[PDB]
Amino acid sequence: PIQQLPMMKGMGKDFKNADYIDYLPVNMLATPKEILNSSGYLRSFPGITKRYDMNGVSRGVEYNTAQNAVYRVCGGKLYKGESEVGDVAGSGRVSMAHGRTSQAVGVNGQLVEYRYDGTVKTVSNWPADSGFTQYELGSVRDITRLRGRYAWSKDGTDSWFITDLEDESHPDRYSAQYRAESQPDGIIGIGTWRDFIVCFGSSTIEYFSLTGATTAGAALYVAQPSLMVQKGIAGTYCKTPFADSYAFISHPATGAPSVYIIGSGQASPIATASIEKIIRSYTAEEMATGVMETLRFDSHELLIIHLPRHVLVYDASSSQNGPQWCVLKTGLYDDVYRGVDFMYEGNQITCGDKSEAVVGQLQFDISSQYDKQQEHLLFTPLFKADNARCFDLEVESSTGVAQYADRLFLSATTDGINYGREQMIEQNEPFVYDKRVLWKRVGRIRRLIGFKLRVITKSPVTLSGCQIRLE
Template sequence: MPVTQVPISQGIRKEIKGGEYIDAIPVNMLAVPKNILDASGYMRSFPGIVKLSDVSGVSRGVQYNAARSTVYRVIGNDIYQNDALLYAGVFDAVSDERVNMAYSATSQAVAAGGVMHIFRYDGTRKTLTPWPASSGYTVFPVGSVNDITRNKGRYIWSQNGGQQFGVTDLDDESHPDRAAPYYTADSQPDGIVGVGTWNEYVLAFGSSSIEYFELTGASGGANIYASQPSLMINYGIAGTHAKCEFMESWAILTGSANGQPGVYVLATGSLSKVSTSTIDRIIDGYSADQLKSAILESFRINGHELLIMHLPNETLCYDATGSANGPQWCQLQSGLNLGKHRGIDYCFDGEKITLADSGGGVWGYLDPAISSQYDEQQEHVLFTPLIKGDNTCMFDLELEASTGFTGLIDSIQISATTDGVIYGAEQTVGFNRPADYDRRVIKRKLGRVRRNIGFRLRCISKSAITLSDMRIRIEI
């Protein structure tokens, strides 16, 4: 009898509204492109979260400071350095608004509440302010600080609702440049939404375009930066935090000013799209105002180059490593009720990847050896495409699994769909038990298939899950 191999890295289902075929993306599972037995890859559970300590407040931002080999993290009203509290009650009022961060050889800067705070490594604390009148320099206003970055020895900041970005003085980074501090993004009449640095360029992100600025090398009061119109991109970002550095470039979530929003990766003067039509549909379910609060971040773990997109009601993950045959996305969730993923602000501290909690109150680190979050079981879901089975009988649905590495007995719940819309009752298959390293994961009898069939695999566990090479024996 013929045996059919069925992919589990991404399924296909039909949309309830309209009946269009869309991707059924995995939940809490990453694709690993490595040949295992007769399969070209396998699926591995997203790393679990181990608690470090309780904290007060919601995570607002994080940055790895290469000058100090230290992670600076803002939680609530406090600033943490690695795992320890550095400054308590830094800001005037506790807030859950996101902050922006940058650093220099002498200081760590945090933009919060319209103010750029500068924390020098010698313990001195300053804010970005105009030169005093007594200095003899022109008093350029700072305005309300929105976003910050660092480029070639200067802090760069953008103003809330403004079309300009400012640069700090080379000798005193707590004041604007003495002669030419401001530069205008002429293609962005709605203002600069955010700023960033890429190689030698300053990037001015607007809602409808991205402008590149390069150092001129001039001095003596001449312009320090000049726009590079040939590199301008006619796509903007949805919000200040809808961008992040990703694989030596930048990833962005575009805004509605350029049509349907999507996720792109910048190249020099161009973009490459990484979101699929299904991901675009999910994004399109939010209004432009809702997307302003979207957050993009990236990190690398066990060879996976991950881009995390935090939307108001869900968290999506793009894995560049597993996308050789097309963009590989999954959905990250917490709990057993399709809850939004709790983890946010991932950062490698030299030993482990630490993260905070989007709901506040706790923070921890990623552990690839487990799949639980703060010692709570998590749900993992995989889908298959619809396969043809005209009037056939199917037997021996088998999965290749890495079993035995668990402290509990786990099972997989398998359900089937014949229309790509509704999945039937779940059937339990024994999957994992302690020290049972050679266990077969197999369901002997499936039954007769009238036309088409697809499957959903669901597992609730605290242990790491590894699945690959799903096969079905078909009798005509």
């Protein structure tokens, strides 16, 4: 009897606490598509090839819909495409926004606006010679743009400000300050969903709409209590517009964190128990430094979360059996993934780097990151097959696009933690499109069994239809 073994999600035990955990695929994305007896396959994440050389590691990215170009902060420089257009001080992640007249960067507690004419301004109070209101402009944490105004949050004081309509280098003349105010504190992040200013605190997410007032001093924004979410975000960059709302990671102020997508006044969990355990392995710090982003290609709608030790990708287009998660990494020994700050421009997806002063372009006919061969994992769930004596381990692989006859390390575990002997079986061949990857004689199953299916390639890996004969 032939039995099909799923490979899109594995299963095992954690030897630290003897609990059951999922084994996520590494450098693999699941694509639901009926190929043959399969109804889905697994394809390696696209590799990275060098595009440009920059001043340092990437610190921010945005698509400038005004200039129709991608602006990247790298090291101490700000680039419009390939050419440097400004100097940015600091060393960490920066906020990025833009409008008609300038590209704004939130860095070092400042909202530095690089105008397209070549001048650089900074948001500051109106001069006292003006008859205009002066505000307590402290530090800047996060910035955003809406309706021709920059809205930014003051660091740790629950307040946010907007810029003037005819002068974006100053706050509003009469009514610039607003507060979330349905909370003791928390203004961690700021964004714009559809036409609202969204203030992401801890334990609250608040929405603000334009009032349409005309009288001087009247409030230009009003909170919408019907749209507010009773949950917060862990860090200033722990949120992204994913599908039509914001996906975020919750603050410890409301319990153990996980991954949520905002619905209508509520948040729906996206993370599984294994993802929650991975998140819980981090302190409150190392969790506020996580960076979230989104990717879109070939009907793939990926949500990428970078942590100091993990890069976790959630696929919303392949989550028909529950949330679909995978791990991105660089190297062969669980080193963190180096790609960050993805952005689609022209007809290519371009990324920054976490460790080198370079930029990539995410080539699709390879799987190596900057010419370095990468590792891919595909586990199968444990199953009870006492005295089964399995045979004919078959997998379907799409061969032909390869530079070497790269192989497959096939091993089996019988306790859920430790894997045994690895056999090397050729899984690809250059210019050969009919290969039949297969291992005839698998051993006898005593109580339990599970397979690892490790590959190391510079070429794309496409695997589907894992099957065994159990006799």
